[PDB]
C-alpha cells in the first residue's frame, strides 16, 4: 500500500475508485495498490 | 505440440531441438535417425519439422517443404539477408526462381493458384529487401 | 463499418444471389479458420462459401421472393452459393458437417422454395 | 436501471407476500424476508413475477433500483435452489474433518483450529482436503467462506492453505 | 469555385462605448464595425454563437451577408480581436464588398503528406496573402511534401494556386523548410 498525495493507474489493469471519501487505486498486482493520503 | 526449423544434414543439435523435444517425452534418437534419413534423401536445404504428441508417448514427425526464406536466399545466391530491407538491395531474382518457389509453396500451402504463391514470395523478398523481377 | 460499406455489401450479396441457382444456409459454430480454409479449398473450385450479417442478408433478400428465409437466420449463418451446378455445395457441406460434428444444416433453397434439413438431404440424395 | 428493469420470475414452489415495504418469501428450503428502500416500489406481477419501480430518476433511486432487483433475485434463488460453495486444501499434512456439526482443521499450528457452525449454515466434508460450505443465504455463505479462507496467511511460495474451487493464486520463487 | 454567403442577423448598436460593449458581450453578442469603399462606418452587434460557428466552418476570412433591419449587405471579415486567455471573440472588422471586387487577404497554408523518415519538416510562414475575387477566397492553401529529400526549400512561388487568384507577396518568402532530422546529440546543445 502506497500512501501519497498523488495516486495514478500505473498499468492498464489499475482501476481508480473512491472508498469512504478517499481515492484509491486497486490492481491485481499488489505493488500497484495505493491510496490517497 | 511444438514446431521447429532445423538443419537437414545433422541431428542432435544443441540450441533448438534438444530441450523442447526433451520436455515432451519424444524419443530423441529415433526421431534423429528418421529425420536424418529423410533429409539425406532430400539433400536440398534445411527442413522444418512439427512435433505431434500422443498419450502413448509415440511421436509423429511432420516434414514440410524447404523454408521459403532459405529458398529465396539460395535463389538470390546470398547467404545472409539484407540488414536494411528496402534500403539496401543485396541481390535480384528473376521470375523463374520465384515461380519455382511459388510451386513449392503451392505444394505446401493452401493457395488455390500459383499466382498467389508467387505474390507471397514477392512479399517475402520485399521483407528481405530483395527485388523481384 | 459504415452505411455505404453496408450498402455495397447488400448489393454484392444481391448480385451473388442473382448469379446462383441455389443457396444453402448452415451453421459454423465451433469452427477453426483451418477448417474454413479446407472447406474453401473443397468448395471455391466449384461453389462459393460466404458469411455476413444476418440482417444485411435480410436486406439483400428483399429483392426477390426470398424473404421467407429470414426465419432461418436465427443464429450464425454461412452462405453457400452454387455458381457451378447446384448440389456439389450441398454434398460437400453435408460431408464437412458429418466430419466436424459442428455444422448444423440450417436449411437450403431450391426452385424458389425454402426447404427443411430432411428435404435438403433428400434433394442431395437425388 | 438495466438490472432494475428486468423482473424476476417466480417458480411455482415458492410462496411470496407483500406487506407494505416488507417482503417475505417461503420456499422448499425455508423462509427468508427482506425490507426494501422507501423510494422504491415493489409489486406482484400477475404473470407470476415481481416488478420493481423507481418513480424518480436521481442517483439514489437509480442506484437502489438495481440493488433491490438483485437482492430480490438472490432471495428467490436462495429458497428455490440454495447456495453452496466448495473449497480445497493444499499443502502436506493439511487435513479437515467434521467434529459433529463443527469443522476441525489441521493447518500446521501447535493446536487444531475449530470453526463453529452459525445458524442456517451446514458443512459437509467429503475428502480430508476437499469440503464445501452450503447454506440458504448468499451473504452468510460468503461470510463463512471468507472467514474459512483467511485461516492461513497468503503463501506465494508453496501455496499451502485453503483455496476456493477454481481460484488461481499468485506465486513467486524464493531461490535461496 | 464560389462560396455561398452565410446568413447572419446584425443589429445596429444603440449605445457604443466600453461599458456598452461589455454589456453586449455579457449577453453573448459580439460588437463589430462595418466599413468599406462606400465610406460609411456602421456599428453592429452580432450573436457570438452563430458567428463563431460560421468562422469555425469557413475559416477566418468568411464571406457574410448581413441582415441589418431588413437590408441585405455583403461583407468580408477583415480582422478579428481575440482575448489571448479566454480565446473568445471581442471585436470583428467587416469590410463592405460587392461582386467582382479584388481583395488582398491572408490565407492559411497547411502541409500534407509524409517526407523521408530522416527529415524534419519546418513551416516558416503560417499564412500567405493572395489577390482574389471577394466571392472566391480559397478556404486554405496546401503544399504536398512527399519524396522530399534532405534540405529542400518550398517558397511562395512554388505554391500551386487555383484559377483566378494571384500571389502578391514576393515568391522568395520561404513557407516550408525541410531539413535533416536533428540527432539526439544535436538537441542537447541548441538552447544552451
Amino acid at each position: 500500500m502506497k500512501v501519497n498525495p498523488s495516486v495514478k493507474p500505473i498499468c492498464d489493469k489499475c482501476r481508480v475508485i473512491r472508498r469512504h471519501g478517499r481515492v484509491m487505486v486497486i490492481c491485481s498486482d499488489p505493488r500497484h495498490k495505493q491510496r490517497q493520503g | 505440440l511444438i514446431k521447429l526449423q532445423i538443419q537437414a544434414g545433422q541431428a542432435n543439435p544443441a540450441p533448438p531441438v534438444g530441450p523442447a523435444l526433451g520436455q515432451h517425452g519424444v524419443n530423441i534418437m529415433e526421431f534423429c535417425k528418421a529425420y536424418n534419413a529423410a533429409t539425406e534423401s532430400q539433400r536440398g536445404n534445411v527442413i522444418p519439422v512439427e512435433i505431434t504428441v500422443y498419450e502413448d508417448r509415440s511421436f509423429t514427425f511432420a516434414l514440410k517443404t524447404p523454408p521459403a526464406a532459405k529458398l529465396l536466399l539460395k535463389a538470390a545466391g546470398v547467404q545472409k539477408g539484407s540488414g536494411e530491407p528496402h534500403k539496401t538491395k543485396v541481390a535480384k531474382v528473376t521470375w523463374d526462381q520465384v515461380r519455382e518457389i511459388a510451386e513449392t509453396k503451392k505444394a505446401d500451402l493452401n493457395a488455390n493458384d500459383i499466382d498467389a504463391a508467387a505474390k507471397i514470395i514477392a512479399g517475402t523478398a520485399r521483407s528481405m529487401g530483395i527485388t523481384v523481377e | 463499418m459504415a452505411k455505404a460499406d453496408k450498402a455495397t455489401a447488400v448489393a454484392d450479396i444481391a448480385e451473388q444471389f442473382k448469379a446462383s441457382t441455389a443457396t444453402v444456409v448452415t451453421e459454423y459454430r465451433g469452427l477453426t479458420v483451418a477448417n474454413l480454409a479446407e472447406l474453401r479449398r473443397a468448395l471455391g473450385d466449384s461453389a462459393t462459401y460466404t458469411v455476413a450479417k444476418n440482417t444485411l442478408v435480410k436486406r439483400a433478400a428483399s429483392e426477390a421472393g426470398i424473404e421467407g428465409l429470414d426465419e432461418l437466420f436465427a443464429g450464425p449463418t454461412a452462405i453457400a452459393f452454387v455458381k457451378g451446378e447446384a448440389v456439389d455445395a450441398a454434398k460437400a457441406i453435408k460431408k464437412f458437417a458429418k466430419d466436424n460434428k459442428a455444422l448444423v444444416i440450417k436449411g437450403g433453397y431450391m426452385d424458389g422454395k425454402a426447404l427443411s434439413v430432411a428435404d435438403v438431404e433428400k434433394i442431395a440424395d437425388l | 436501471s438495466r438490472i432494475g428493469k428486468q423482473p424476476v420470475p417466480v417458480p411455482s414452489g415458492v410462496d411470496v407476500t407483500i406487506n407494505g415495504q416488507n417482503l417475505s418469501v417461503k420456499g422448499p428450503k425455508g423462509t427468508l424476508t427482506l425490507d426494501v428502500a422507501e423510494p422504491i416500489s415493489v409489486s406482484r406481477a400477475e404473470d407470476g413475477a415481481i416488478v420493481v419501480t423507481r418513480p424518480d430518476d436521481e442517483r439514489r433511486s437509480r442506484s437502489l433500483h438495481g440493488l433491490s432487483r438483485t437482492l430480490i433475485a438472490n432471495l428467490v434463488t436462495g429458497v428455490t435452489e440454495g447456495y453452496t460453495q466448495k473449497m480445497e486444501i493444499f499443502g502436506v499434512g493439511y487435513r479437515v474433518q467434521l467434529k459433529g456439526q463443527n469443522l476441525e482443521f489441521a493447518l500446521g499450528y501447535s493446536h487444531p483450529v475449530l470453526i463453529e457452525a452459525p445458524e442456517g449454515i451446514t458443512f459437509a466434508v467429503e475428502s480430508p482436503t476437499k469440503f464445501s460450505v452450503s447454506g440458504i443465504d448468499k451473504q452468510k455463505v460468503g461470510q463463512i467462506s471468507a472467514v474459512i479462507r483467511r485461516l492461513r496467511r497468503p503463501d506465494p511460495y508453496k501455496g499451502k492453505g485453503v483455496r476456493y474451487e477454481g481460484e488461481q493464486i499468485r506465486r513467486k520463487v524464493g531461490k535461496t | 469555385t464560389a462560396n455561398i454567403p452565410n446568413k447572419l442577423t446584425a443589429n445596429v448598436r444603440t449605445r457604443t462605448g466600453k461599458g456598452a460593449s461589455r454589456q453586449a458581450r455579457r449577453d453573448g453578442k459580439v460588437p463589430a464595425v462595418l466599413y468599406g469603399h462606400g465610406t460609411d462606418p456602421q456599428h453592429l452587434e452580432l450573436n457570438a454563437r452563430d458567428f463563431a460557428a460560421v468562422l469555425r466552418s469557413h475559416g477566418t476570412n468568411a464571406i457574410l451577408t448581413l441582415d441589418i433591419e431588413g437590408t441585405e449587405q455583403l461583407a468580408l471579415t477583415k480582422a478579428l480581436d481575440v482575448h489571448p486567455i479566454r480565446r473568445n471573440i471581442q471585436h470583428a472588422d467587416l469590410l463592405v464588398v460587392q461582386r467582382g471586387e479584388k481583395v488582398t487577404v491572408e490565407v492559411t497554408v497547411l502541409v500534407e503528406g509524409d517526407a523521408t523518415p530522416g527529415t524534419l519538416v519546418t513551416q516558416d510562414a503560417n499564412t500567405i496573402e493572395i489577390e482574389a475575387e471577394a466571392l472566391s477566397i480559397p478556404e486554405q492553401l496546401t503544399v504536398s511534401v512527399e519524396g522530399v529529400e534532405a534540405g529542400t526549400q518550398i517558397t511562395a512561388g512554388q505554391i500551386s494556386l487555383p484559377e483566378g487568384v494571384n500571389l502578391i507577396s514576393d515568391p522568395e518568402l520561404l513557407v516550408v523548410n525541410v531539413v535533416e532530422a536533428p540527432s539526439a546529440e544535436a538537441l542537447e546543445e541548441e538552447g544552451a
Binding site: - | - | - | - | 477566418t60 489571448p84 524534419l120 532530422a181 536533428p182 538537441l187 542537447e188 541548441e190 538552447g191 544552451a192
Partner: protein
C-alpha cells in the same frame, strides 16, 4: 544555462508583474507551445530543466524553441547581514512572464508524445500553464 553577453546596468529594479501579455501570445515557430496563466519570474535554471526534460522525452527527432530569455538580473545580499550598506550583488537571471505569454515551442510528428513532453516541461515551471496549438 542562459546568461546575456553583457548588460548596460547590472543592478535594476524588479520587473513588474502587472497586466497580461501583449506580445508573443501565439505559437509561431513550432506546432505546439506552452502558454503561461500566471505571473512569475522564471529563472534560467528552470528553463534549463524544462528544456532538458522536453529533450529527454522527445529523444531523437523534433526541434525546440525557447521564446523567453532571462535578461533581467536579481541581486541578493550576503547572508547574516543587517539591512543597509548598499545593494546586493547580481546572482539570478530571470525573465518576466505574464499570462498569455507563450514560453516554449515544439514541433514533433506525433501528438501524444508532443503533449507528453510539453507536460513534463510544465511540471518544472513555477506557473500554471497550458498547451496551445496553431489552430483557432
Amino acid at each position: 544555462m542562459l546568461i546575456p553577453r553583457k548588460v548596460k546596468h547590472r543592478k535594476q529594479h524588479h520587473p513588474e508583474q502587472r497586466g497580461i501579455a501583449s506580445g508573443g501570445t501565439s505559437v509561431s515557430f513550432g506546432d505546439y507551445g506552452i502558454q503561461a496563466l500566471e505571473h512569475a519570474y522564471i529563472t534560467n535554471r528552470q528553463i534549463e530543466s524544462a528544456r532538458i526534460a522536453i529533450n529527454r522525452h522527445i529523444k531523437r527527432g523534433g526541434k525546440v524553441w525557447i521564446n523567453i530569455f532571462p535578461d533581467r538580473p536579481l541581486t541578493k545580499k550576503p547572508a547574516e547581514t543587517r539591512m543597509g550598506s548598499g545593494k546586493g550583488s547580481p546572482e539570478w537571471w530571470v525573465a518576466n512572464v505574464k499570462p498569455g505569454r507563450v514560453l516554449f515551442e515544439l514541433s514533433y510528428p506525433d501528438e501524444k508524445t508532443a503533449r507528453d513532453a510539453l507536460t513534463r516541461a510544465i511540471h518544472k515551471l513555477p506557473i500554471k500553464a497550458r498547451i496551445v496549438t496553431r489552430e483557432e
